[PDB]
Design a protein around this ligand. Structure first.
Ligand code: SF4
Lengths: 628, 290
């Protein structure tokens, strides 16, 4: 099987083979046939009476664990713990953002750059704004956001875009969210030996936990990031490994937390550091981003995107990365080993993510700019250790357009609003094109890479099929970066891949057929968008012809995302089977009974063409239900 | 019934009416009997633009229903909707041709029916010059004669060439609107199919001024969209046939504005209840400068 559809990826894999270094593909091959029990989710290790493995085939072999737990119980608890872990990752990201908001000041390193956005958020949090200092407002907003994480009395605060009907449905179902850390703790408590042994209740607890990710953690992280670093607008950038410069210092930012990457971008324009880069013999400083931190700095500043998850190692294989600065999440620990074969400084900066044999330079949130300058100076000084004979940068990079926040999308939609009719600054043109049938629907393509799928193949095939069927596509994360590398994030792509209705819409609004809405936490924006459409049409989000796809997901964060997208009322297709096939009841809940609960359900489909067909059929049947 | 289904239903009704009237023409006059429009050089302009074929006898008119049949594909995608609008336009043209071959004088005053080529050439000079900054296709009935007269005279005072289809003709007559080719208020006919008589104005504008040869349908549609500043104001309740004819106008690149609740399409299908702002809304939608 081919390892990737990306030519630059293939060239660097040949180079890695020539250099005698191992990749994620090599380790996947070394793992050989993976354990069937773990793959089906019928293995349990929740107590030291175990490990227990029960048969993935009902009626044969061992039926219960030592405590008496069935295959359905073991599967449901394993799934719930994946959701809890994903929720924890996203919530910790949002908590750091809220704490940064709490420390903003007029003369400090972290300021308020979008005051209108802050005032709207303050309105959503019942924070007074009129005749008040902007930083007093910011601190009050940060306090309310922080209380969302750990309040023990009262109800949490949810964005106004969430329909009232969806909230009432959640309350009736028993999944209405509480404080984020409280829900994570509840899931961890109920999976403990001898607690919850009922699959339906376990799945409902996991949905409840995932809601605190989708609508509170990721949402607050995104909106506070907009407040502090600016709301994204349409902006040009370049993507894929070709963005590395042979003659410049190459600094690659990998990870998820945006404050460090924002401070590194600011430090790169420091005159002393630019002079130092010149003095070490480089033309300048070339900042490149990877994964979600790359998505953030690219959405807000046009920083070039070096690559997505399964390309991180190959970035080092070029031999041109002088510094690789990582914060947390989706940072392959093998990088520490791999950087030994090159001059690269692999720099960890977060106390949450220590990696053995990496260079640890703790990013100081109290003095973010000075700390970022010190880290960047280490990366720049490493340019003297470059071995130019080992350098091979593929001449493969692609132009991309991104920055499509909900605000930017609304601004673009204002173009097709007749001034004599109005209203302006709404999602009404999008609702109109969806209701009329010019657009069949909207689909979100999100998720990681996975060695089980030819890298980027499923993302590209799913996106092309959807836009060919007049389904407008919004992309986040590594899927968005796969689209960027391929060339879908271009206005020209409208006439090259889209169907007639979507091509007309793209021409009228002057947008690409695929809209890059940011990082994984920026999936909250998608929720926001859908909610607005629903609120404009007076229906629940489960009545709309919308869907989400995770063609190549790998992370626990992806599991939590799919769970809260389904719980919000949006059908979700998974291109990688989750470890639930061992529990028939869990499969039936996720793919059949969920529709009775929340009006949406999971679809497991490993063939992208079949997934596109199923998405189109499901959207059409929801349209016929809605009468459009 | 959604927009696509409404357009498909309208196109099927137009096809049924065309089949009935063609059967009547075949029964009364014979398949060798001549089929023509008064003083034109492009036979039936819509069929000539779509295929390049000139319809000369009744048998060929009966064979032209296959064009309407092949232009109706009931799949909910935008291209099929535009093709279905074009099918309605072809069916309306066939109905008008059958009217002309059945009756010696199908239209009486003030209705003018078909517009001859010399009138098109006369209007071409003020069209490109800018003395005619647009073509207002008014179809249906306004709630009052006063509002219809007000809108029509507002268009007239701005130099636009306004064409009238339906009961709006009677409302304008009650409103003391002075009509004629020099007064730029042209009543086409009381039936919806009479709207084709302004559509052929645009089509022949591509045939005469644009120089596009017959059968180059995409070139004709591009020319009408980028050169002919026409728009539709549909007043009063809209049947499926009216919506299908509006889909044809959209296929020609002409935006359709109405006072009725319809599934809106930005820049193409717009609802404007306020009759005091309909003229400005149409001028903005068609990008017309006075
Ligand atoms: S919780 Fe039950 S099934 Fe799991 S390891 Fe312990 S005894 Fe075995």
């Amino acid at each position: 099987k081919a390892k990737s559809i990306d030519q630059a990826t293939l060239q660097l894999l040949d180079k890695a083979k020539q250099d005698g270094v191992e990749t994620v593909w090599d380790r996947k091959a070394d793992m050989k046939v993976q354990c069937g029990f773990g793959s089906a989710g019928v293995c349990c290790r929740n107590c030291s009476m175990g490990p227990c493995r029960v048969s993935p085939v009902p009626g044969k072999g061992v039926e219960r664990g030592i405590c008496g737990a069935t295959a359905d119980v073991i599967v449901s608890r394993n799934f719930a713990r994946m959701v809890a872990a994903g929720t924890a990752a996203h919530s910790d990201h949002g908590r750091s953002i809220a704490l940064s908001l709490y420390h903003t000041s007029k003369d400090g390193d972290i300021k308020v750059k979008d005051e209108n956005k802050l005032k709207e958020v303050a309105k959503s949090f019942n924070v007074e704004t009129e005749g008040r200092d902007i930083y007093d407002i910011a601190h009050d907003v940060a306090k309310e956001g922080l209380s969302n994480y750990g309040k023990q009395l009262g109800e949490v605060t949810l964005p106004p875009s969430l329909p009232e009907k969806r909230k009432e449905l959640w309350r009736k179902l028993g999944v209405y969210p509480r404080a984020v850390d409280r829900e994570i703790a509840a899931v961890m408590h109920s999976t403990h030996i001898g607690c919850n042994a009922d699959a339906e209740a376990m799945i409902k607890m996991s949905m409840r936990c995932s809601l605190t990710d989708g609508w509170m953690g990721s949402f607050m992280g995104t909106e506070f990031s907009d407040i502090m670093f600016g709301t994204p607008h349409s902006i040009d950038t370049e993507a894929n490994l070709g963005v590395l410069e042979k003659n410049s210092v190459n600094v690659v930012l990998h990870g998820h937390e945006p404050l460090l990457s924002e401070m590194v971008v600011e430090a790169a324009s420091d005159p002393e550091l630019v002079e130092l880069a010149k003095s070490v013999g480089a033309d300048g400083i070339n900042l490149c981003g990877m994964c979600c931190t790359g998505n953030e700095v690219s959405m807000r500043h046009g920083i070039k995107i070096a690559g997505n998850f399964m390309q991180q190692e190959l970035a080092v294989v070029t031999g041109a990365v002088d510094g690789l600065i990582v914060d947390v999440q989706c940072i392959m620990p093998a990088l520490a080993k791999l950087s030994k074969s090159y001059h690269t400084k692999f720099i960890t900066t977060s106390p949450k993510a220590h990696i053995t044999d990496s260079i640890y330079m703790e990013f100081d949130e109290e003095n973010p700019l000075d700390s970022a300058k010190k880290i960047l100076k280490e990366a720049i000084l490493n340019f003297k250790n470059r071995d130019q004979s080992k350098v091979m940068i593929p001449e493969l990079k692609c132009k991309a357009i991104l920055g499509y926040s909900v605000e930017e999308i609304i601004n673009k939609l204002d173009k097709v609003v007749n001034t004599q009719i109005g209203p302006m600054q709404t999602v009404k043109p999008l609702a109109d094109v969806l209701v009329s049938g010019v657009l069949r629907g909207a689909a979100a393509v999100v998720g990681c890479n996975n060695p089980k799928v030819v890298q980027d193949s499923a993302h590209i095939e799913t996106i092309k099929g959807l836009i060919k069927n007049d389904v407008i596509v919004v992309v986040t994360g590594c899927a968005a970066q796969a689209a960027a590398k391929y060339g879908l994030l271009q206005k020209e792509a409208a006439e090259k891949y889209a169907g007639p209705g979507l091509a007309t819409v793209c021409k009228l609004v002057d947008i690409p057929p695929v809209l890059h809405m940011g990082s994984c936490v920026d999936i909250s924006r998608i929720l926001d968008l859908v909610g607005r459409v629903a609120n404009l049409l007076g229906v629940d989000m489960s009545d709309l012809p919308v869907a989400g796809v995770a063609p190549e997901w790998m992370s626990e964060k992806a599991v939590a995302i799919g769970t809260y997208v389904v719980t919000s009322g949006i059908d979700t297709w998974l291109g990688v089977a989750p470890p639930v096939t061992g529990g028939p009841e869990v499969v039936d809940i996720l793919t059949n009974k969920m529709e009775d609960w929340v009006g949406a359900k999971f679809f497991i489909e490993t063939d992208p063409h079949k997934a596109v067909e199923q998405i189109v059929n499901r959207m059409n049947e929801k349209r016929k239900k809605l009468g459009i | 019934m959604n927009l696509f289904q409404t357009v498909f239903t309208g196109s099927k009704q137009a096809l049924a009416a065309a089949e009935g009237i063609v059967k009547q023409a075949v029964d009364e006059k014979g398949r060798d009997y001549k089929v023509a429009f008064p003083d034109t050089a492009y036979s039936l302009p819509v069929i000539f633009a779509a295929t390049g074929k000139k319809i000369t006898n009744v048998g060929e008119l009966e064979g032209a229903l296959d064009i309407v049949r092949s232009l109706i594909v009931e799949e909910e995608m935008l291209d099929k909707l535009l093709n279905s609008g074009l099918a309605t336009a072809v069916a309306a043209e066939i109905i008008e041709a059958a009217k002309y071959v059945l009756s010696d004088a199908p239209y009486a005053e003030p209705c003018v029916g078909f517009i001859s080529d010399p009138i098109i050439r006369s209007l071409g000079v003020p069209l490109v010059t800018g003395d005619i900054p647009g073509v207002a296709v008014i179809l249906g009935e306004c709630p009052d004669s006063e509002t219809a007269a007000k809108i029509i005279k507002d268009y007239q005072s701005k130099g636009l060439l306004t064409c009238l289809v339906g009961k709006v003709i009677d409302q304008a007559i009650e409103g003391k609107v002075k009509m004629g080719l020099d007064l730029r208020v042209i009543p086409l006919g009381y039936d919806v199919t009479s709207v084709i008589h302004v559509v052929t104005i645009a089509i022949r504008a591509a045939l005469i001024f644009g120089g596009i040869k017959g059968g180059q349908l995409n070139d004709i549609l591009k020319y009408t969209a980028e050169r002919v500043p026409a728009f539709v104001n549909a007043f009063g309740p809209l049947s499926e046939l009216v919506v299908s004819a509006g889909a044809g106008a959209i296929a020609l690149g002409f935006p359709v504005l109405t006072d009725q609740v319809v599934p809106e399409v930005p820049t193409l299908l717009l609802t404007q209840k306020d009759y005091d702002k309909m003229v400005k809304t149409s001028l903005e939608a068609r990008n017309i400068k006075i």
